[PDB]
Amino acid sequence: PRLYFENRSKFIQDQKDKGINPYPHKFERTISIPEFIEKYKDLGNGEHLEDTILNITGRIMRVSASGQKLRFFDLVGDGEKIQVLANYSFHNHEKGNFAECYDKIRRGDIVGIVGFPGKSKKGELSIFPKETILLSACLHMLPMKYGLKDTEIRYRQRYLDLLINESSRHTFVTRTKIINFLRNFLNERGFFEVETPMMNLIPFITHHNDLDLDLYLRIATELPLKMLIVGGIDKVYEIGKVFRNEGIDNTHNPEFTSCEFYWAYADYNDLIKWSEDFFSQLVYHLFGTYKISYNKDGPENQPIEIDFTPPYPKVSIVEEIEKVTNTILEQPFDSNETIEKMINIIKEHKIELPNPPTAAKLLDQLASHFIENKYNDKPFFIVEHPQIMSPLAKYHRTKPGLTERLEMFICGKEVLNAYTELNDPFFCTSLEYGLPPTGGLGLGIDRITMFLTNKNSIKDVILFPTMRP
Amino acid sequence: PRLYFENRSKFIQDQKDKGINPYPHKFERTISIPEFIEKYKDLGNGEHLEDTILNITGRIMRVSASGQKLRFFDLVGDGEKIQVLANYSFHNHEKGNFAECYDKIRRGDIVGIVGFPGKSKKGELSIFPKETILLSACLHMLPMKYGLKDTEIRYRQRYLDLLINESSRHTFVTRTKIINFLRNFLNERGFFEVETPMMNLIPFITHHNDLDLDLYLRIATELPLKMLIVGGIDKVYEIGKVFRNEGIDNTHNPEFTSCEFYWAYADYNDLIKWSEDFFSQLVYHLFGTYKISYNKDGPENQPIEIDFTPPYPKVSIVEEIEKVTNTILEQPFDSNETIEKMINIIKEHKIELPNPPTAAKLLDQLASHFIENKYNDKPFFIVEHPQIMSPLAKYHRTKPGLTERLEMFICGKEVLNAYTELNDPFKQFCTSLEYGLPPTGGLGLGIDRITMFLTNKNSIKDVILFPTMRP
């Protein structure tokens, strides 16, 4: 184990002395494995193309022998596999001894191979080397599936994870496939991508040494973005990192990825139509249907189905709480007496942490309880939140005490938040130069990716999650 | 001035009790100003489309009057401009006084307009309102050109800049066009974009409360990118923010934007052609040729012509020094007396800051004097660097002391920097290398610096929407 190492190290020195470079400078490929597969998969069993000479590379993942006239390797690259069939009859002996060269090879080794394509007798697609040259050696024991999963080194050595586990590589592709989708989605709808400062002055604190000033890592991207709208970029967005300095767990990472866009002269039906479009067209683009399975209770429980077929419910938060709790407060002052009702509900009905007793805090727990877990079979919108809960959203045309806010929910997890902005000052300076009627919108990216890759931890959607040593 | 503001506020509280909402809820536009021009730009001077009723919104950038049946305005939207022509004849009197309405309107006001297309007699493209509403008001005196440039309020208030200076918004669109093009270029070549931490443990420091632990802000993306290569993602990049906790000025911001990719089984030739394909194609994508104008010494001075037509010159650094300084140094132990030979040059030749006189430091200096400013009529590659300056590149095949690094220069500024990685754990994360890192080529970019050359700027603050500015 540590012995495996020193022996490989010793081995590497001995090939340097024997006059070999175990880390040569360049081996020139002809083909990647995925290209080799598409071309020769449709070959026939036993078939050889002896007139085809190919230079290929990859990592050795299995090795096995069969008489020292015969040698077998699994070779991987780009998350696709083929077989190395080393036959003594084809081995160019002018370069070296058949068995002396092939007993050198170990699981993990990156090799260059020069040979021809073919299937074996059983129908297993293969490269037949005339020559095999080490490109880079694996000095450690490469572990096995079971070895990891479930282990913490999936995260501390994600490279091992990407090699051994076929499914984690697929997860990370999907996340990129999702982001590209999003970006192109906006771009088609005339939006405009921009970067704004990570660092500010409004909670992660860092010190700019020169300026002797404390700097502030962004929690959001709203403000610079709203200000660009004043600047007269009517459609603008940022896909980027934000930060929370809190606890670290399986739902909690120091840097999340957010997207936020602003949309001048865009109202409520507009934002909804967008959110409904985005998700129906994302999910379809990934899976070919609007229907997917998600393990809400983990892998040790069942999957449930989620129908991203539009349109989706819209649930007014106060209407649906009056309805169910069967008291009334539409009373668009939600304080004093109306605090008592809500407080009385919290204890009367089952329970829940009061928290510091703010009506907006009360309100949240009551939608958390009675609404957020309404629909699991589909994504839906909680809607027309009170002003008290939402200090930045323009007033509801008709309904007093109320906004035109929209949140999107999937399995009781928030995913999309949006509203038409409160443009009447009566950054706070920018607002005085005129901000037109505007719709803003923030997506949770990692969470969305958790759904579409069917993960229950965020570490499983972020390549290098932050980990206590 | 702060009274204008007092009057506008006053005006605003006055519309409310007059029974208006001067920040209404929804106006519903039929058309955008770019759409309006595109559509009606091929009209005939004088031609009116009175039947055709459009809605539209826009900021007011200008106001005149003409005897009070007439009122004129400039409206701007999405970096485009049109003329407002408010004629009493067409005014719809049900809604309010023609006079009373168009007198509230100030410069910097966002308005809904209902009206029809038509060119004037002069053939100036116009919107002719029958009704005009206030959406949101400029409560402040909106400055003009002259007003800003050359001011810090181009930065500390980037909206004003975006509105008034059409040549600034031109510029930040071009930033975006470039990064889109880069993104598209890697993608079309089978590269895979990814995201790595901005915070780590290895110079901006920030405490993490609940771990009672100091985190650090990333300076490059190279390390976790290489790891991804060992994980068998073979073509990989990130486009994103790196940081320096160093001094701020017109070359320096705490937040830069870099793109870095690794590419497996890629050599020097591969890296070179990459770079010459990219620059040549980027420039042709933006401008229509390979020839662009840059103002190296500023707008106050003359411009130069830079030709991005490939191929470009490859200048082997040590070689060119030996050829210019007419001394001979390599002697692939670049230390002791080799240092001296360089120091004497540094002394004998003009001079130059030694710095703490390190060999690699001495070598960097030499290159800035004798090479880096050789070409200004085209981009060229400084090439085959010492291992001593480049501790992370593979050795040259045949030339001792050297590497197969390439580093690109436009007008003596560093723009691109690539090299095949040193994969042998015994000539040097240091873990992962021991799992086998295939032969590989890495490459980094200065997005900002590149946007500068292509947006003809000399200041980084003219290419980053919100430069970090003394508070």
* Same fold yes or no, B1-146 and B147-467: no
- B403: DSSP letter: B
Looking at domain A147-465, its CATH architecture is 2-Layer Sandwich (3.30)
Packed helices A317-325 and A359-370: angle between N→C axes, nearest 10 degrees = 70
Tokens 């007798």 map to which residue? A121
> Which residues, in sequence order, are CB contacts of B298 under 8 Å at separation 6+?
B458
d(CA A132, CA A105): 10
Q: Which residues from A are below 8 Å from B211, CB to CB?
A: 248, 468
- How far is the alpha carbon of A36 from chain B, nearest alpha carbon, in Å? 16
In this structure, are strands B235-243 and B192-193 parallel, antiparallel, or unpaired? parallel
The percent of chain B in helix, strand and coil, each rounded to the nearest 5, is: 30, 25, 40
d(CA B220, CA B202): 12
Strands (E), A308-412: 314-316, 380-383, 406-410
- Burial annotation B453-465 (CB, 10 A radius, 16+ → b, else e): bbbbbbebbbbbb
Q: Which H or E run contains B223?
A: helix B222-230
C-alpha distance from residue B220 to each of A218, A301, B216, B233, B241 (Å): 20, 41, 12, 19, 9
Q: Which H or E run contains B278?
A: helix B268-286
CB-based contact A436 B136, cutoff 8 Å: yes
Nearest by Cα to A91 from A82, A83, A101? A101
> Which residues, in sequence order, are CB contacts of A377 under 8 Å at separation 6+?
A304, A305, A306, A307
* A422 touches B21 (CB < 8 A): no
d(CA B214, CA B199): 10
A31 to chain B, any CB pair closer than 8 A? The answer is no
Handedness of CA A24, A30, A35, A41 (dihedral sign): negative
| Residue A325 falls in which region: left (phi positive, over 0), alpha (psi -120 to 50) or beta | alpha
Give chain B's end-to-end CA distance (angstroms, integer): 23
Write the residue in B110, B199, B245 that is nearest to A466 by C-beta. B199
Among residues 323-352 of chain B, which lie with CB inside 8 Å of chain A?
none
Q: Which residues from B are below 8 Å from A240, CB to CB?
A: 241
* Angle made by CA atoms A372, A376, A378, in degrees to the nearest 5: 105
B359 to chain A, any CB pair closer than 8 A? The answer is no
Write the residue in B110, B257, B471 that is nearest to A436 by C-beta. B110
* B328 touches B322 (CB < 8 A): yes
Assign B64 to helix, strand or coil.
strand
Interface test with B, best of A20, A136, A423 (most B CBs within 10 A): A136
* A148 touches A163 (CB < 8 A): no
How many CB atoms neighbour CB B42 within 10 A? 7
Q: Which amino acid, A9? A: S
Q: Which residues from B are below 8 Å from A77, CB to CB?
A: 232, 234
Looking at domain A1-146, its CATH architecture is Beta Barrel (2.40)
* B460 touches B448 (CB < 8 A): yes
CB-based contact A159 B228, cutoff 8 Å: yes
CA dihedral B146, B151, B153, B156 (to 10 degrees): 160
C-alpha distance from residue B368 to each of A265, A299, B372 (Å): 53, 60, 5
Q: B147-467 in CATH: which number? A: 3.30.930.10
* B153 touches B142 (CB < 8 A): no
B136 to chain A, any CB pair closer than 8 A? The answer is yes
- Burial annotation B185-210 (CB, 10 A radius, 16+ → b, else e): bbeeeebbbbbbbbbeeeebebebee
Q: Which amino acid, A253? A: N
* B450 touches A37 (CB < 8 A): no
B196 to chain A, any CB pair closer than 8 A? The answer is yes
Structural resolution in Å: 2.9
C-alpha distance from residue A34 to each of A81, B234, B437 (Å): 8, 12, 20
> Which residues, in sequence order, are CB contacts of A57 under 8 Å at separation 6+?
A27, A29, A77, A110, A111, A112, A113, A135, B265, B438
A147 to chain B, any CB pair closer than 8 A? The answer is no
Extents of the domains making up chain B:
1-146, 147-467
- How far is the alpha carbon of B393 from chain A, nearest alpha carbon, in Å? 12
- A371: DSSP letter: T
> Which residues, in sequence order, are CB contacts of B338 under 8 Å at separation 6+?
B329, B330, B331, B359
Q: Which residues from B are below 8 Å from A429, CB to CB?
A: 157
Alpha-helical regions (H) of B19-85: 33-40
CA dihedral A397, A402, A406, A408 (to 10 degrees): -150
Q: Which residues pair with B55 in a beta bridge?
A: B114
**What does residue A127 show for φ and ψ, rounded to 5 degrees?**
-110, 135
> Which residues, in sequence order, are CB contacts of A226 under 8 Å at separation 6+?
A262, A421, A427, A430, A435, A438, A440
Q: Which amino acid, A327? A: T
Q: Which residues pair with A215 in a beta bridge?
A: A206
d(CA A274, CA B336): 68
Q: Which residues from B are below 8 Å from A159, CB to CB?
A: 227-228, 230-232, 432, 435
Packed helices B359-370 and B317-324: angle between N→C axes, nearest 10 degrees = 70
